[PDB]
């Protein structure tokens, strides 16, 4: 298995690779959003509780 | 809306479409004039015909297909025939030269001046289309000429249309009959040029077609009339879900989704169970159990690939006519209880049913019986590893003795491409090996 994946430049199939490179960056923010949503929601919860 | 387009390349690929449109025109009341009876069904092209005929204001059903070829003989013949007034005037594109079976010749020497015109035709059809689910490409792997043009035009329509489905039917190499010496070469070229763009490919072995013919249609001298009529009925079955209604309806998108497990390997097989004649039908009975067993019979397949040598993973049953889910599911349960059938541990279930109430059709001068319950068995199985093994251990010999290559090098290609093709085939075969491993 001779490695060759270093830099070159031609990209015959590149659209989908970049599209999925958008996937982790779109997900991470949703994860952070659900974290902070959790903390604020529980705060509201026992606030209304008392 | 719901419509597709038909592409026919190669004088192999012409009479097949000829018989196909014969069946189509028979079934949708289409006459050799091109105009219906005095019944009111003419308009802007919005009814059952709307999927393959654009019967515009001229009242003439205009088929949504294109016939191309490189030699004028067959196309001028079908111009002299009976259906030419139906066929669109210049939807018949013809060159004046052959390709010497040379895929490289038909892809590089001559293809550079016909692809433009055919692209113009394709766009002027797709614009009047509205839904454009897909194309139906008919070429031949062992094509005397239909190799290089099929490859190149398929590539270019891929790079201009990036999402829609592609259905490609081919005649496979005959494993024990060679009517063309460089056929394995053309086959390997087509494979490693098309797999990365081809969407859904079906093969078929005409030797096994004839074997079926003289097994149960008990004629010792069948002909291309018969050989084309059978596959025409097959395609009628596959587009029945669009033509008529049913309890449940399936589409080519569902076909590709649930029929291909992984990328790359996308080569299923077909079978028509009720291939039976007038007298056997007339004094023998029909029902779900025997039609199912007949379609899963190990020998009635049109490709030499013994299931016991292979292994199954996917099955699409298509029942056309009157039929009931009760015995449908009962019979599929019986087949699962059968132990000879082998479904890999990957798939506990791989079965998709599709029901149409409308029964299929006979044709005047037909060779078929009067069918009521019909089934397409469309299955994907691992049984085609031997198919590529036989052709690779054929091809390696001719390359190690480098016979006939002077023709190709003279027309203007080179050999590193053959090297890449050979290693690609090796990779595919080993992939078959690991997927066979459970």
């Amino acid at each position: 298995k001779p490695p060759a994946w270093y830099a070159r430049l031609p990209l015959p199939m590149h659209r989908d690779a970049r599209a999925q490179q958008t996937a982790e960056v779109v997900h991470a923010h949703a994860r952070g959003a659900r974290l902070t949503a959790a903390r604020l929601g529980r705060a509201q919860h026992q606030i209304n509780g008392q | 809306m719901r419509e597709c387009i038909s592409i026919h390349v190669g004088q192999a690929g012409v009479q097949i479409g000829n018989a196909c449109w014969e069946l189509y025109c028979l079934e949708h009341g289409i006459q050799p004039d091109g105009q219906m009876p005095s019944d009111k069904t003419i308009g802007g092209g919005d009814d059952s015909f709307n999927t393959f005929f654009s019967e515009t204001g001229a009242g003439k059903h205009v088929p949504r297909a294109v016939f191309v070829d490189l030699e004028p003989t067959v196309v001028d013949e079908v111009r002299t025939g009976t259906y030419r007034q139906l066929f669109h005037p210049e939807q018949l594109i013809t060159g004046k030269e052959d390709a010497a079976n040379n895929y490289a010749r038909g892809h590089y020497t001559i293809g550079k001046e016909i692809v433009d015109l055919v692209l113009d035709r394709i766009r002027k059809l797709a614009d009047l289309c509205t839904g454009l689910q897909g194309f139906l490409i008919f070429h031949s792997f062992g094509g005397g000429t239909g190799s290089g043009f099929a490859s190149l035009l398929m590539e270019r329509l891929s790079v201009d249309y990036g999402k829609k489905s592609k259905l490609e039917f081919a005649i496979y190499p005959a494993p024990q009959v060679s009517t063309a010496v460089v056929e394995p070469y053309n086959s390997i070229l087509t494979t490693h040029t098309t797999l990365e763009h081809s969407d859904c490919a079906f093969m078929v072995d005409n030797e096994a077609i004839y074997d079926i013919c003289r097994r149960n249609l008990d004629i010792e001298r069948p002909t291309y009339t018969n050989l084309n009529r059978l596959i025409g009925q097959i395609v009628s079955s596959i587009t029945a879900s669009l033509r008529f209604d049913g309890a449940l309806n399936v589409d080519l998108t569902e076909f590709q989704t649930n029929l291909v497990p992984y990328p790359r390997i996308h080569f299923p097989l077909a079978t028509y169970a009720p291939v039976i004649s007038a007298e056997k039908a007339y004094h023998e009975q029909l029902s779900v159990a025997e039609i199912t067993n007949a379609c899963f019979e190990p020998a009635n397949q049109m490709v030499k690939c013994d299931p016991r040598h292979g292994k199954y993973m996917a099955c699409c049953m298509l029942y056309r006519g009157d039929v009931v889910p009760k015995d449908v599911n009962a019979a599929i349960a019986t087949i699962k209880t059968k132990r000879t059938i082998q479904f890999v541990d990957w798939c506990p279930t791989g079965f998709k049913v599709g029901i149409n109430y409308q029964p299929p059709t006979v044709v005047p001068g037909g060779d078929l019986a009067k069918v009521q319950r019909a089934v397409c068995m469309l299955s994907n199985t691992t049984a085609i590893a031997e198919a590529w093994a036989r052709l690779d251990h054929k091809f390696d010999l001719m390359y190690a003795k480098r016979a006939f290559v002077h023709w190709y090098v003279g027309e203007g290609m080179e050999e590193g491409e053959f090297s890449e093709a050979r290693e690609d085939l090796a990779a595919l075969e080993k992939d078959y090996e690991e997927v066979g491993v459970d």
């Binding site: 923010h29 952070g32 959003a33 659900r34 974290l35 902070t36 949503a37 959790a38 903390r39 604020l40 929601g41 529980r42 705060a43 026992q46 606030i47 008392q50 | -």
Partner: protein, 57 residues
């Protein structure tokens, strides 16, 4: 599923405002107060004021 997300987030004693901040329960701490991330200071103030008000509660 808020309930399952928060429990599988690690830290069990979330402080829940009321409950004392158990020094070892804090595992995954929030990203820093920044205007672009999911930690804008508008909530950073609010959690504090709510916490102290609930302290007198």
């Amino acid at each position: 599923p808020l309930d399952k997300v928060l429990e599988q987030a690690g830290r069990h004693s979330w402080v829940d405002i009321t409950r004392p901040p158990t020094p070892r329960t804090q595992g995954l701490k929030t990203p820093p107060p920044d205007p672009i991330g999911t930690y804008t200071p508008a909530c950073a103030k609010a959690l504090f004021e709510a916490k102290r008000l609930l302290m007198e509660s």
